[PDB]
Amino acid sequence: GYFYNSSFRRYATLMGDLFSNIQIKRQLESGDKFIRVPITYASKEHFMMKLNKWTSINSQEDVAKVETILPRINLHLVDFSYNAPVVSQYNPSPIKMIYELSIFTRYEDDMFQIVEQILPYFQPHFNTTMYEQFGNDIPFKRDIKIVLMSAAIDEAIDGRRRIEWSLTFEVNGWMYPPVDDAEGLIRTTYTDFHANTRDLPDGEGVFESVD
Amino acid sequence: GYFYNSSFRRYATLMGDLFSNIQIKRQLESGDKFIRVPITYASKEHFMMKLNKWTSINSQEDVAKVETILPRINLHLVDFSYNAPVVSQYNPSPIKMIYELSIFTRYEDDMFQIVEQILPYFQPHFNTTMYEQFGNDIPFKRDIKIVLMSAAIDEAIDGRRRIEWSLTFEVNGWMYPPVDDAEGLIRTTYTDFHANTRDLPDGEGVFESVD
Amino acid sequence: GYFYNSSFRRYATLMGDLFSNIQIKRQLESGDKFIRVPITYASKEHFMMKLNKWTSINSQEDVAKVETILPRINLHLVDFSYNAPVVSQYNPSPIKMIYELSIFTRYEDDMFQIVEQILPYFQPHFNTTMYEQFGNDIPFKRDIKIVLMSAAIDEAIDGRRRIEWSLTFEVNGWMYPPVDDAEGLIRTTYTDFHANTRDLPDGEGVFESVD
Amino acid sequence: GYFYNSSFRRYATLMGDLFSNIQIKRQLESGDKFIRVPITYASKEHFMMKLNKWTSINSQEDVAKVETILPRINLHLVDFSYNAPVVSQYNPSPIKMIYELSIFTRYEDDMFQIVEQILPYFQPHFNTTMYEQFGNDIPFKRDIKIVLMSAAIDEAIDGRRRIEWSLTFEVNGWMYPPVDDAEGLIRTTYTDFHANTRDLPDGEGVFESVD
Amino acid sequence: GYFYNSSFRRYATLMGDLFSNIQIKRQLESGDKFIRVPITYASKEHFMMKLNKWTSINSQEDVAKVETILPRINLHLVDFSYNAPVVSQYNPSPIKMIYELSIFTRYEDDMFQIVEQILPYFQPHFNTTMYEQFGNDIPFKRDIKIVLMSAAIDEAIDGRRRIEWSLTFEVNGWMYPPVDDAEGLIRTTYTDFHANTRDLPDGEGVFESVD
Amino acid sequence: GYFYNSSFRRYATLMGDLFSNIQIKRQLESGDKFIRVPITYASKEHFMMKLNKWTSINSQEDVAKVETILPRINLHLVDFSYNAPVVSQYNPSPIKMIYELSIFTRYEDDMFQIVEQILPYFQPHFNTTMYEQFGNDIPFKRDIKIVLMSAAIDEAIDGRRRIEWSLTFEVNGWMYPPVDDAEGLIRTTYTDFHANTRDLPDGEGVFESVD
């Protein structure tokens, strides 16, 4: 029920999965608890609407169930353009994609931990080699440059309430016409922030559903 | 009831027809269904008005027939200017025309499919050779450069509701004074995204009528 | 009841008259009908007010009489400045005058026809030699460059309603102090869009009255 | 009841007087009537307030007296700055003064007449030699350059009503500390638009009082 | 009740005092009256509040008293920044300070007089040598350049009412850490608009109190 | 209950502590009283809301306790970016951090005292060498350049009421991935405005709690 080999989907999942494995330390009496930051893919307005819905105190079980919601990260595509350096598709087209990575947090410390886990890997760019194999052929080698373009710090108060920092990223990637899922599912690998060759998980696995 | 040989009409139809034959795959229980994206030519404000009129659930048969409406594409001319590099018409005038191609979709996946079918052919430009023959004379050969200028991503929510992406295109074309339909209808051919020589269909054939 | 030899008047009429003789083809049951596009000289705000007064369906004999109103063209001066390349007047002062030519239309087709009759003659400029003779002396030869600067496309809806495209033109002309109508009326000729030497008609002849 | 030798006052009057002597022809049956355009010096907002006060139909004795009010010209200073090319005053300081000259008119024809009498003398500048004599000493020779910087066209409707064109002028003049009226009144002459050496009239003669 | 040796205070007082001694001539029947223009140091908003408070007619004794309030001058610091050309304080730090000098007046004539007394001494700059002596040591010589940056003309009406012209000045001065008033009071002299060496009056002497 | 070795935290504390020790002189009859200006770390809006909560005169016990609140300083991070001049962390990444230092005060004199204690040490930059030791290893030497970028002056009145000046600072520092507190606590020293090597106090000591 979705175009699996979509190039946009692959870039969405790649970006999401780079930021999928981020935890914050939270000290308890019995001991330190490390919690994973759940990440979604959605238009920002959408996400924020639904976030205002979850954070709403309707009953007594909600009062507690409120601090499990934050911290979280929302991801979205916001712009793209041709990337000015016989047919077209591997050899493919140099495209350039703009992503907003929106971190939301109830505690400045939460934010500090998270961003400290992101920010140092972009100087200002972070390279990743991606391998996309078609059926059983030799995989393709796509050089992917991800550039940290800018950051944006903001709040939204009520008495605490909610800290929001947004990073903007430029992916220098590759576009080509759709290759039907029926012609075979694309196998994809990439190098993470430590040059560790992870293989790209299916979409359904990286993003929690806002729905 | 229209000036058939209109230069503007030909550019509207040319653009519309390049993007006329775009389908999205939609996986069903019985098997995959492929649906064509219907295309219109209209002022954007107009299109959106009539679209809000259609999207309104008036009766029970409308509730279903709503997701037959989307996806669609609306096309319009939004600007033109002289294209700065004895009488006038073949030799004609280098003109430059600005088109807004507006894709509306209920599902991110629909969008991904469509745009993946448009975007790779503009690097940033796409050439097409056009042949316009007058009655039975030797056809004229007009070199047409179409350049992808920018993209713009947006929403418009209600609880799903509607994704809207707009591509802006610069057509580098040719203008000349009207040649009366009474002097004979122009025969028009062109090269598609695959250098395949289709001949330009009548207006009534490419655009579904917003009316 | 007006300064006949007014320099501004002469430019208003020249511009008005270049665009005075434009017809659109309108296919009927009995056969093709050609209708002339009527031109007025007025502040834009004004013109649109009176146009909203005329187009308002107050009654039934109006219901029909509404589609005789459109299409039309309103012309106006909007800016002027010294034209940086013993006393003053022939030898006169190089002035530069800015005109807004506003085309209004109920049908996209009407617009296409009209503008296709304007646009090809400005690449980006259109020359005209003007001859202004004083009484019976040797006429003066003023070289007039008219440059197409920009175009602007708009609507204004109600259920159709009205298409509005405005061209902006830079006339590079000549200014001098007023020469009394009592010293004799100035004779003026010019070369039209086909270099055919028409002579400049009186104001009352070119523009229908907005009043 | 005012500092007669005021430098600001002198420039205000020079400007007003260059534009003091302007008439429009107004054709009647009995014969042509020439009317002088009255000029005032006032903040623009002020002038317009009082002008809305005069033009209001309070009675029938007012109804006639309305078309004697327009046309008029309001003049005002709107900016000044040092003019970047032992003590201070002749030798004096190069200053630069900015004037808004505002023409108001009930008929486009009136405007054409007036502005046609102003505009050709500024190409883009108009020089005037000014002679300022102290008591009986040798007059000082101040070269004054007046530059037409821009023009601005506007209306203000009610059913006719009122045309407003504003010229902006850069006077390149001279400033020095105040020379008391008790030390003797300054004698001032200048060259008009025709190099005719008029001598600068007292303020009260050039400007009608808005008060 | 204040840090007497404050560097900011010294610059505020220096500026205030250059403009402390400005009079306007006011011709009366009995004879000419010269009135000194009172100067305050305050935030512009503040000053205007209190000015509206003073100018308000609450009783009958106010009616007369009210027309003595204008003219006046309000002064304030509005910006400062480092002034780009072993420890720090004489040798001290080149700072640059921005002052708004705001002249308010009921009569154009009053304004003309005042400004004619300010404006000619800035071409565009006015130099002044300042001497700050510590206890009994050799005085320090600080070169102070004051530059006239821009001017701004405005009104505020009611039936007269009030003219407001503002000069903006860049003082190129010197900052250093605070030298306690207990370590001895700094003695300060400077050169006025005529290179005449006045010594800096205490704050309380230059500015009338807005409080 | 916070990531002690957080880099953002260290820079917040470094900045806060350079400005931790600022006093103003306040003359009493019994003798001069020196009061330390308290510093907080908070988003500006937050600080201002809570400041409006403290400044509200609710009772008589409140009326006195009003002038103990001011003066104060609020500090916050507002922007950051890569600082464009085998793995990453000491060797670490050149980052650039933007801080808004907001000084609030009831008296101009208070402001003058404070800012005079800040401003002279930034010409436009101030260097500090920081030593960060991990457990017991050899310290790291991070060169920290703090640049004064701009200042901004404002009020907020009610009859006095409150002066607000804001300095903006560019810290040219260093980022690296989080080093767990469990791996040992970081020891930090730095050179203050006088090259005095103080050691960085814990967060809890520098900032008063806004909560």
Q: Do C112 and B6 touch (CB under 8 A)?
A: yes
Q: From CA F137, how far away is CA F141, in angstroms rounded?
A: 12
Tell me how crowded residue D184 is: count the other CB atoms within 10 A of its CB. Answer: 14
Concatenating the DSSP letter of every residue in E142-186 gives EEEEEEEEEEEEE--------EEEEEEEEEEEEE-----GGG-PE
Q: From CA A21, how far away is CA C191, in angstroms rounded?
A: 76
Q: From CA F174, how far away is CA F93, in angstroms rounded?
A: 5
Q: From CA A207, how far away is CA B108, in angstroms rounded?
A: 15
Q: Which of B116, B157, B194 lies at the smallest CB-CB distance from A178?
A: B116
The Cα angle at residue A89 between residues A87 and A94, in degrees rounded to 5: 105
* Residue D35 and residue D22 in contact, taking contact as beta carbons nearer than 8 Å: no
Grouping H, G, I as helix, E, B as strand and the rest as coil, residue E59 is coil
Residue E94's nearest CA partner among E7, E186, E199 is E7
Show which subunits contact E, needing at least 3 CB pairs below 8 angstroms.
Answer: D, F
Angstroms from C192 CA to nearest CA on chain B = 12
Angstroms from D122 CA to nearest CA on chain C = 8
In the block, tokens 């500006």 appear at F44
Residues 100-159 of A with CB under 8 A from B: none
Q: From CA D120, how far away is CA C93, in angstroms rounded?
A: 6
The Cα angle at residue F95 between residues F92 and F97, in degrees rounded to 5: 140
In the block, tokens 């003595």 appear at E68
- CA distances in angstroms from C144 to C99, C160, D103, D113, F107, listed in the order given: 14, 40, 28, 22, 68
Four-residue CA torsion sign, E119, E120, E126, E132 = negative
Question: Which DSSP helix (H) or strand (E) runs through F44?
Answer: helix F44-54
For A121, which DSSP code?
G
In the block, tokens 């922007």 appear at F79
Angstroms from F175 CA to nearest CA on chain A = 6
SS3 assignment for chain B: CCCCCCHHHHHHHHHHHHCCCCEEEEECCCCEEEEECCEEECCHHHHHHHHHHHCCCCCHHHHHCCCCCCCEEEEEEEEEEECCCCCCCCCCEEEEEEEEEEEEECCHHHHHHHHHHHHHHCCCEEEEEEEEEECCCCCEEEEEEEEEEEEEEECCCCCCCCEEEEEEEEEEEEECCCCCHHHCCEEEEEECCCCCEEECCCHHHHCCCCC
β-pair type (B186-191, B125-134) = antiparallel
Grouping H, G, I as helix, E, B as strand and the rest as coil, residue E57 is coil
Concatenating the DSSP letter of every residue in C8-55 gives HHHHHHHHHHHTSS-EEEEE-SSSEEEEE--EEE--HHHHHHHHHHHS
Residue A104's nearest CA partner among A61, A42, A148, A62 is A42
Residues paired with B163 in a beta bridge: B105
Residue B90's nearest CA partner among B44, B45, B142, B126 is B142
* Residue D32 and residue C4 in contact, taking contact as beta carbons nearer than 8 Å: no
Q: Which are the contacts of B209, defined by CB distance < 8 A and separation ≥ 6?
A: B40
Q: From CA E47, how far away is CA E211, in angstroms rounded?
A: 10
Grouping H, G, I as helix, E, B as strand and the rest as coil, residue D10 is helix
Q: Which of E3, E7, E78 lies at the smallest CB-CB distance from F153?
A: E78
In the block, tokens 């005789």 appear at C68
* Residue B210 and residue B52 in contact, taking contact as beta carbons nearer than 8 Å: no
Q: From CA C67, how far away is CA B42, in angstroms rounded?
A: 21
Q: From CA D90, how far away is CA C80, in angstroms rounded?
A: 38
Which residues on A lie below 8 Å from F3 (Cβ)?
A: 24-25, 109, 112-113, 116
* Residue B186 and residue B133 in contact, taking contact as beta carbons nearer than 8 Å: yes
Q: Do F113 and E6 touch (CB under 8 A)?
A: yes
Residues paired with E102 in a beta bridge: E74, E166
In the block, tokens 């070289």 appear at C143
Residues paired with F166 in a beta bridge: F102, F152
Residue F47's nearest CA partner among F160, F164, F202 is F164
The residue length of chain D stands at 211
- CA distances in angstroms from D68 to D56, D58, D110, D114, D211, listed in the order given: 13, 16, 13, 16, 18
What are the φ/ψ torsions at residue D15 (nearest 5 degrees)? Answer: -55, -50
Q: From CA D16, how far away is CA D203, in angstroms rounded?
A: 9
Which residues on B lie below 8 Å from C119 (Cβ)?
A: 80, 93, 95, 175
Query: Residue A93: closest CA among chain B residues belongs to which residue?
Result: B120
Q: From CA E97, how far away is CA D122, in angstroms rounded?
A: 40
Q: From CA B107, how far away is CA B164, in angstroms rounded?
A: 10
Q: Which of D27, D113, D121 lies at the smallest CB-CB distance from C88?
A: D121
Preceding peptide of B124 cis, ω within 30°: yes
Angstroms from A50 CA to nearest CA on chain B = 9
Q: Do E113 and D3 touch (CB under 8 A)?
A: yes
Query: Helices B7-18 and C108-118, interaxial angle, to 10°?
Result: 120
* Residue C101 and residue C75 in contact, taking contact as beta carbons nearer than 8 Å: yes
Q: From CA A112, how far away is CA F2, in angstroms rounded?
A: 10
CATH topology of domain C2-211: STM4215-like (3.30.2000)
Residues paired with E75 in a beta bridge: E41, E101
β-pair type (B32-36, B23-27) = antiparallel
Work out the burial of residue E53: count CB atoms within 10 Å of its CB; fewer than 13 is exposed, 13-18 middle, 19 or more buried. exposed
Q: Do D151 and C81 touch (CB under 8 A)?
A: yes
Angstroms from F177 CA to nearest CA on chain E = 35
Query: Which structure tokens are listed for C19?
Result: 């665009």
Four-residue CA torsion sign, E174, E180, E181, E182 = negative
Q: Which of C7, C84, C94 lies at the smallest CB-CB distance from D116?
A: C7
Q: From CA D149, how far away is CA D156, in angstroms rounded?
A: 24
Q: Do D87 and E120 touch (CB under 8 A)?
A: no
Tell me how crowded residue E102 is: count the other CB atoms within 10 A of its CB. Answer: 22
What's the CA dihedral at E119, E121, E123, E124 to 10 degrees?
-60
Q: From CA C36, how far away is CA C114, in angstroms rounded?
A: 10
Tell me how crowded residue B166 is: count the other CB atoms within 10 A of its CB. Answer: 17
Q: From CA B207, how far away is CA C150, in angstroms rounded?
A: 29
* Residue E155 and residue D43 in contact, taking contact as beta carbons nearer than 8 Å: yes
Query: Residue A28: closest CA among chain F residues belongs to which residue?
Result: F1
CA end-to-end span of chain C, whole Å? 15
For D207, which DSSP code?
S
Residue D26's nearest CA partner among D38, D17, D37 is D37
* Residue F19 and residue F118 in contact, taking contact as beta carbons nearer than 8 Å: yes
Q: How far from chain centre, in Å, is Cα A143?
A: 19
Q: From CA B177, how far away is CA B158, in angstroms rounded?
A: 48
Q: From CA C136, how far away is CA C142, in angstroms rounded?
A: 17
Which residues on C lie below 8 Å from B80 (Cβ)?
A: 119, 151
Q: How far from chain centre, in Å, is Cα F205?
A: 12
* Residue A17 and residue A197 in contact, taking contact as beta carbons nearer than 8 Å: no
Q: Which of B25, B119, B153 lies at the smallest CB-CB distance from A79?
A: B153
Residue E78's nearest CA partner among E178, E208, E167, E174 is E167
Angstroms from E4 CA to nearest CA on chain F = 9
Q: Which are the contacts of C105, defined by CB distance < 8 A and separation ≥ 6?
A: C70, C71, C111, C114, C162, C163, C164, C165
Query: Residue E112: closest CA among chain D residues belongs to which residue?
Result: D8
Q: Which of B43, B79, B82 lies at the smallest CB-CB distance from C123?
A: B82
Tell me how crowded residue E60 is: count the other CB atoms within 10 A of its CB. Answer: 8
β-pair type (C72-82, C39-41) = parallel
Q: How far from chain centre, in Å, is Cα A141?
A: 22
Strand stretches in F17-109, DSSP E = 23-27, 32-36, 39-41, 72-82, 93-105
Angstroms from E87 CA to nearest CA on chain F = 8
Which residues on E lie below 8 Å from D10 (Cβ)?
A: none
- CA distances in angstroms from A52 to A66, B162, B163, listed in the order given: 11, 20, 21
Tell me how crowded residue C111 is: count the other CB atoms within 10 A of its CB. Answer: 22
Buried/exposed B50-81: b ≥16 CB within 10 Å, e otherwise: ebeeebeeeeeeeeeeeeeebbbbbbbbeebe
Grouping H, G, I as helix, E, B as strand and the rest as coil, residue D62 is helix
Strand stretches in A83-158, DSSP E = 93-105, 125-134, 140-154
β-pair type (C140-154, C125-134) = antiparallel
Strand stretches in chain C, DSSP E = 23-27, 32-36, 39-41, 72-82, 93-105, 125-134, 140-154, 163-175, 186-191, 197-199
β-pair type (C93-105, C163-175) = antiparallel
Q: From CA C141, how far away is CA C134, in angstroms rounded?
A: 12
In the block, tokens 């009493």 appear at F28
Residue C128's nearest CA partner among C138, C148, C142 is C142
The Cα angle at residue A81 between residues A80 and A82, in degrees rounded to 5: 140
Q: From CA D189, how far away is CA D201, in angstroms rounded?
A: 9
The contacts found for D134-139 with CB under 8 angstroms, 24 or more apart, are: D134/D179, D134/D184, D134/D186, D134/D187, D135/D183, D135/D184, D139/D187, D139/D189
Angstroms from D68 CA to nearest CA on chain C = 17
Which residues on A lie below 8 Å from F82 (Cβ)?
A: 122-124, 148
Query: Which structure tokens are listed for E132?
Result: 């700050």
What are the φ/ψ torsions at residue B60 (nearest 5 degrees)? Answer: -80, -35
The residue length of chain E stands at 211
Residues paired with E172 in a beta bridge: E96, E145
**Sheet of strand F163-175: strand arrangement:** F39-41, F72-82, F93-105, F163-175, F140-154, F125-134, F186-191, F197-199
- CA distances in angstroms from F142 to F114, F130, F190, F195, listed in the order given: 28, 5, 10, 15
Interface test with E, best of D4, D5, D6, D44 (most E CBs within 10 A): D6
Residue F79's nearest CA partner among F93, F94, F99 is F99
Q: Do E175 and F148 touch (CB under 8 A)?
A: no
- The number of C-beta contacts closer than 8 angstroms across D and E is 65
Q: From CA D146, how far away is CA D165, in angstroms rounded?
A: 19
Q: Which of C32, C120, C194 lies at the smallest CB-CB distance from B176?
A: C120
Q: Which of D1, D6, D81 lies at the smallest CB-CB distance from E116?
A: D6
Way the structure was solved: X-ray
The residues spanned by each domain of chain F are 2-211
PDB resolution in Å:
2.7
Query: Which structure tokens are listed for C12?
Result: 């208003």
Maximal C-alpha separation, chain D: 66
Q: From CA F3, how far away is CA F12, in angstroms rounded?
A: 13
Residue D18's nearest CA partner among D73, D78, D92, D95 is D73
CA end-to-end span of chain E, whole Å? 15
For E44, which DSSP code?
H
Residues paired with B173 in a beta bridge: B95
Query: Which structure tokens are listed for A84?
Result: 């000015």
Residues 169-208 of C with CB under 8 A from D: 175-178, 180-182
Query: Which structure tokens are listed for E140?
Result: 């320090």
* Residue A132 and residue A139 in contact, taking contact as beta carbons nearer than 8 Å: yes
* Residue E203 and residue E29 in contact, taking contact as beta carbons nearer than 8 Å: no
